[PDB]
Amino acid sequence: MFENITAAPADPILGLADLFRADERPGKINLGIGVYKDETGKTPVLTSVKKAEQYLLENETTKNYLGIDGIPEFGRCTQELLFGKGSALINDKRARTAQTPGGTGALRVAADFLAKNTSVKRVWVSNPSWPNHKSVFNSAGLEVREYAYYDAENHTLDFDALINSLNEAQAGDVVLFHGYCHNPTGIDPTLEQWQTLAQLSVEKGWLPLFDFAYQGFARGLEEDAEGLRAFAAMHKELIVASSYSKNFGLYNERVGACTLVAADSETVDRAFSQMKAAIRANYSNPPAHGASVVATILSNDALRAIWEQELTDMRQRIQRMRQLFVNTLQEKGANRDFSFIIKQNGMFSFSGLTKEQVLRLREEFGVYAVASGRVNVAGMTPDNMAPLCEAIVAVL
Amino acid sequence: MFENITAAPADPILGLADLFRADERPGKINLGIGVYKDETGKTPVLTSVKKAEQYLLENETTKNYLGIDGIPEFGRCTQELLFGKGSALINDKRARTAQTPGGTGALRVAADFLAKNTSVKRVWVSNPSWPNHKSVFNSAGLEVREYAYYDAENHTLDFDALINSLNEAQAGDVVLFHGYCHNPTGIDPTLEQWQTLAQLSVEKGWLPLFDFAYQGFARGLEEDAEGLRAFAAMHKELIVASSYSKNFGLYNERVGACTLVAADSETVDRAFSQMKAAIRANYSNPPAHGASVVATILSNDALRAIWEQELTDMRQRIQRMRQLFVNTLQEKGANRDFSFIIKQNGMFSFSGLTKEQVLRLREEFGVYAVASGRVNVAGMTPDNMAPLCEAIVAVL
Ligand SMILES: *Cc1c(COP(=O)(O)O)cnc(C)c1O
Numbered sequence: 175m176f177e178n179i180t181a182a183p184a185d186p187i188l189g190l191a192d193l194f195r196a197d198e199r200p201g202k203i204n205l206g207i208g209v210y211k212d213e214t215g216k217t218p219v220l221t222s223v224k225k226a227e228q229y230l231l232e233n234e235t236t237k238n239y240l241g242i243d244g245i246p247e248f249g250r251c252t253q254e255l256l257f258g259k260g261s262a263l264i265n266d267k268r269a270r271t272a273q274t275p276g277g278t279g280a281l282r283v284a285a286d287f288l289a290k291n292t293s294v295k296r297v298w299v300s301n302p303s304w305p306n307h308k309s310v311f312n313s314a315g316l317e318v319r320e321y322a323y324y325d326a327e328n329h330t331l332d333f334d335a336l337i338n339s340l341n342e343a344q345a346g347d348v349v350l351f352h353g354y355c356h357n358p359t360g361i362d363p364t365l366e367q368w369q370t371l372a373q374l375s376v377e378k379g380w381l382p383l384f385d386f387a388y389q390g391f392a393r394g395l396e397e398d399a400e401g402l403r404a405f406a407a408m409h410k411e412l413i414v415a416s417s418y419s420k421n422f423g424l425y426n427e428r429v430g431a432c433t434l435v436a437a438d439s440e441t442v443d444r445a446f447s448q449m450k451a452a453i454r455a456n457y458s459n460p461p462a463h464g465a466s467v468v469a470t471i472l473s474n475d476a477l478r479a480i481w482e483q484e485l486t487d488m489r490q491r492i493q494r495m496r497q498l499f500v501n502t503l504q505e506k507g508a509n510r511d512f513s514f515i516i517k518q519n520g521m522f523s524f525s526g527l528t529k530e531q532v533l534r535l536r537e538e539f540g541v542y543a544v545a546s547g548r549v550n551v552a553g554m555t556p557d558n559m560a561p562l563c564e565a566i567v568a569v570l
Numbered sequence: 571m572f573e574n575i576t577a578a579p580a581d582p583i584l585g586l587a588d589l590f591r592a593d594e595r596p597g598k599i600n601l602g603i604g605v606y607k608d609e610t611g612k613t614p615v616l617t618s619v620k621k622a623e624q625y626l627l628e629n630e631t632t633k634n635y636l637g638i639d640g641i642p643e644f645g646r647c648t649q650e651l652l653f654g655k656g657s658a659l660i661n662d663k664r665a666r667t668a669q670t671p672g673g674t675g676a677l678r679v680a681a682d683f684l685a686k687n688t689s690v691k692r693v694w695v696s697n698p699s700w701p702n703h704k705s706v707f708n709s710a711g712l713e714v715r716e717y718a719y720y721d722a723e724n725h726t727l728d729f730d731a732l733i734n735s736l737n738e739a740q741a742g743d744v745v746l747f748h749g750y751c752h753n754p755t756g757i758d759p760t761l762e763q764w765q766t767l768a769q770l771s772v773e774k775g776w777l778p779l780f781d782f783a784y785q786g787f788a789r790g791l792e793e794d795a796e797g798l799r800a801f802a803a804m805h806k807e808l809i810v811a812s813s814y815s816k817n818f819g820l821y822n823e824r825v826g827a828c829t830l831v832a833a834d835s836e837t838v839d840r841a842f843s844q845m846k847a848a849i850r851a852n853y854s855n856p857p858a859h860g861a862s863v864v865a866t867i868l869s870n871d872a873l874r875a876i877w878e879q880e881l882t883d884m885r886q887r888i889q890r891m892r893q894l895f896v897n898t899l900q901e902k903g904a905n906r907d908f909s910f911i912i913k914q915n916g917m918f919s920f921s922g923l924t925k926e927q928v929l930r931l932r933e934e935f936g937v938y939a940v941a942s943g944r945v946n947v948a949g950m951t952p953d954n955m956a957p958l959c960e961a962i963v964a965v966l
Pocket residue numbers: 208275276277278279304352357385386387417418419425429430853854
């Protein structure tokens with residue numbers, strides 16, 4: 175049965191981690207996967223999560239199965255994080271959320287749901303976008319179409335091109351928007367652009383699907399939710415696939431949510447019963463650990479205060495590294511102006527390096543970036559800034 | 571988009587838990603979902619797992635992403651549990667395992683893999699079988715066909731009917747076998763019958779897929795793996811979807827494995843790269859908590875000794891409850907011979923109650939069983955044995 179199975183091509187983001195491991199050189203630098211690193215190049219588990227874990231260890235009475243949709247409090251906390259505390263979606267009971275294995279699991283659950291319960295056949299994703307989007311939607315049977323986004327010459331958001339590209343999108347098409355900290359560009363729409371987009375989609379009949387994986391990494395929790403709320407305020411339907419992997423440093427615990435909003439309570443509930451059937455036929459019910467950690471921290475005032483500060487530290491440290499990167503590039507002889515980097519949000523800098531420059535950096539210098547030129551600024555520390563910038567200016 | 575979505579029919583096993591919760595009556599008894607209960611009707615987290623969790627809390631340095639396939643040691647321990655310590659599959663590097671979100675997640679991963687990488691279109695499942703099998707395979711696009719299994723009059727395994735049914739199965743078809751403690755009947759093949767089945771499938775060209783969710787609940791760990799090893803010994807290819815939800819009381823942590831075996835190392839590896847691509851497009855990488863708990867317990871001699879005894883206690887207590895059930899049924903006036911119940915393995919007794927008897931028990935007596943007549947003997951305690959048996963003899 176398996177004789178003719180061909181080998182899958184390595185994952186552009188995840189297979190990079192394997193190469194780096196297989197690397198015997200001393201000063202290799204990993205600017206690949208989107209995992210936060212502190213000043214010492216470690217990825218510690220947050221103090222707020224260690225505390226919640228101790229609490230879980232003291233207080234859990236059972237490992238009995240959660241419901242298909244997970245921990246209710248987890249869902250309630252997600253809705254408030256996404257939509258706002260006194261939100262109308264919340265008060266009108268227009269939203270239902272299922273806890274899922276990470277944001278990827280939420281995107282998948284959304285895909286399967288749409289594929290088996292609606293008339294959707296096409297999903298629009300930006301160019302460029304997180305490389306695994308195409309793959310998740312293609313797995314559910316939907317096709318992926320691309321809309322213009324980034325202007326590589328000017329390193330800006332080419333809004334008119336975005337708009338004109340999206341004009342090929344039909345009524346009933348799913349259009350995927352990133353929350354904030356666009357992966358991989360770091361280029362995001364202004365709020366005005368978000369309102370323009372919100373009125374346009376309501377008018378063209380698109381179903382918005384938001385991939386929200388970096389809430390809190392640009393300006394703050396409530397601020398990063400602006401585009402999505404602008405949308406929620408005028409759409410009767412939408413789905414949001416959120417992740418707590420990056421903002422809680424809970425990467426391997428697989429914590430995410432897929433929230434579904436419809437016109438009213440009765441409709442969203444009927445629609446949710448199908449989402450649940452889709453979950454049951456996939457992984458059955460979600461893993462409790464990471465999500466009860468998130469529910470515990472979010473529900474406890476002291477624990478939340480500590481987490482928000484840890485998230486504030488992550489954000490500010492990345493901001494400090496961006497600056498250090500553009501300055502050091504200048505001091506090291508990079509004769510190109512990399513200052514556009516100062517203008518991007520999140521962990522990623524779309525460097526504008528060619529696929530061959532990216533190949534040379536890793537092959538001659540052990541510096542690891544995604545072939546697209548995406549670099550992890552959060553993976554940069556003041557100790558590796560110099561050798562890294564020397565490697566870069568040498569392939570330029 | 572969601573206006574015409576119909577409500578999904580409630581899950582036969584999982585929606586039962588909701589009804590039971592919505593129930594305001596005092597003495598309701600839940601004999602529904604396959605979750606173990608101790609003499610007091612609680613589902614404690616095992617002492618061996620609480621200890622491993624403390625260790626994890628003390629020793630974890632990061633929550634950084636696991637590989638798509640998980641914790642390597644988890645995979646190694648699974649292979650030894652399934653195939654044996656000095657196994658040829660292990661020594662020849664013929665097997666590859668991916669850690670998955672539960673056994674369901676493993677069945678799904680297997681389905682997606684087979685659907686997108688082989689020429690499989692049909693999966694054969696027993697009649698009856700775990701209700702969610704059809705649903706997982708149908709989700710991947712495969713069709714489910716049924717093979718004869720249980721003789722309801724004699725409450726035995728109708729082996730000739732099994733064999734003759736399976737004759738409609740073509741070369742290249744997937745045939746799903748349960749490890750041991752067949753869900754829902756508790757009726758399993760003798761080892762001789764397992765060897766007969768192993769030679770037959772090798773001859774007819776079937777690809778065996780084992781759902782192993784109760785290893786250790788019939789006779790013991792190594793003993794319950796007999797049928798599967800009988801098969802492994804003569805098949806060049808097979809996939810096993812195992813679960814640690816029941817044998818480690820780790821239900822909500824979602825701990826399972828999908829192991830893939832091919833003719834040689836090169837083939838299984840090439841085949842595994844596609845399994846990994848399938849995982850990446852679903853939930854990305856698996857949740858660490860439950861699996862590192864399992865790896866820790868399995869790798870530590872003291873911790874393993876304690877777990878094996880806890881599993882021995884679970885098994886023996888269920889055995890004591892079966893007996894108590896048939897005796898009390900006799901003492902309570904159940905004029906039907908329920909002694910076949912003594913002959914079943916695992917947590918489930920296929921009672922032979924009609925769908926209406928099952929409806930009356932829950933509606934008039936608050937006793938909850940699956941509509942199929944499947945009862946959870948592990949959910950029985952000496953405190954609820956009497957009112958439960960009185961309810962049953964009253965609907966007979
Ligand atoms: C990280 C990420 C995801 C999901 O990651 P999970 O680790 O599955 O939580 C989804 N979309 C984007 C844009 C991401 O950056």
